[PDB]
């Protein structure tokens, strides 16, 4: 996925999957 954003350990920015 190119849209996903890592924002913390084991966590992505909301709805970026």
């Amino acid at each position: 996925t190119r849209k996903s954003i890592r924002i913390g350990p084991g966590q992505a920015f909301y709805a970026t999957g």
Epitope: R2, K3, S4, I5, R6, I7, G8, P9, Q11, A12, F13, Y14, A15, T16
Partner: antibody
Framework: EVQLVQSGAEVKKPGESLKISCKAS????????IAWVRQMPGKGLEWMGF????????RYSPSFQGQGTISADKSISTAYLQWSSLKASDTAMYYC?????????????????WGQGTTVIVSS | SYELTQPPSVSVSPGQTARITCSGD??????AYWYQQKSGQAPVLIIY???KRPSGIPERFSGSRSGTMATLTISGAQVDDEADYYC???????????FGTGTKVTVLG
């Protein structure tokens, strides 16, 4: 060369509309979030919101919701920020920036490619 | 809404170590990022994911995060390191990014 080039300085009056632009080149425009950052004269950086050009997924910080519309036209690799009714308090430098372009910051939240900024003055 | 707090002013002499803190209640689970902004210039990313330097950024810049605080450290401060420094992170819900209030680092040259 990966690059974001912003439109030129603007001087407007309250109530007028304005659309400023951020032209991307040297990379796949659809695949990276583009953010807009406001900096009022002598103040700090404020994250307004960002857009993923592939599907135009657009998010705003709560205080910037409805205070400036972010959009993108991927056919000409350009992101935009616009107001239909400017206020004096919109006076600021505006930057656009790409998220996660370089190295291990790819897929991440660091804004690592920046436009040169657009100065906007709104005054009666 | 979510805010990241920074001291407004830090001063150092050349060769000394400057430390810049960033505090917020969502930091225990969210990465910190640091930006440097020199007078007249656009911001530059200097630290991402707490502690990682992009290439071209000098090793004298380091970062850490623990609990509600993230810290940017500038070892052996140089005159050209004088700038505004902004931390940056998301709210706990991961629905927006915010900048810290900014710290002016003065290097007494």
């Amino acid at each position: 060369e990966v690059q974001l080039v912003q439109s030129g300085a603007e001087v407007k009056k309250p109530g007028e509309s304005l659309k400023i632009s951020c032209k991307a080149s040297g990379y796949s425009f659809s695949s990276y979030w583009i953010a807009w950052v406001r900096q009022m004269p002598g103040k700090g950086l404020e994250w307004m919101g960002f857009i993923y050009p592939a599907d135009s997924d657009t998010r705003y910080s709560p205080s910037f919701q409805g205070q400036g519309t972010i959009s993108a036209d991927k056919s000409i690799s350009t992101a935009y920020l616009q107001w239909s009714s400017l206020k004096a308090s919109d006076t600021a430098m505006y930057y656009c920036a790409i998220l996660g372009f370089w190295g291990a910051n790819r897929g991440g939240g660091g804004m690592d490619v920046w436009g040169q900024g657009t100065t906007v003055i709104v005054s009666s | 809404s979510y805010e990241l707090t920074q001291p407004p002013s830090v001063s150092v002499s050349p060769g000394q170590t400057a430390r810049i803190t960033c505090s917020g209640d969502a930091l225990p689970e969210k990465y910190a990022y640091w930006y440097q902004q020199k007078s007249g210039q656009a911001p530059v990313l200097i630290i991402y994911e707490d502690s990682k330097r992009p290439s071209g950024i000098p090793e004298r810049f380091s970062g850490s995060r623990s609990g509600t605080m993230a810290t940017l450290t500038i070892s052996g401060a140089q005159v050209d390191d004088e700038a505004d420094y902004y931390c940056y992170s998301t709210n706990s819900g991961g629905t927006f990014f915010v900048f810290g209030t900014g710290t002016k680092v003065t290097v007494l040259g």
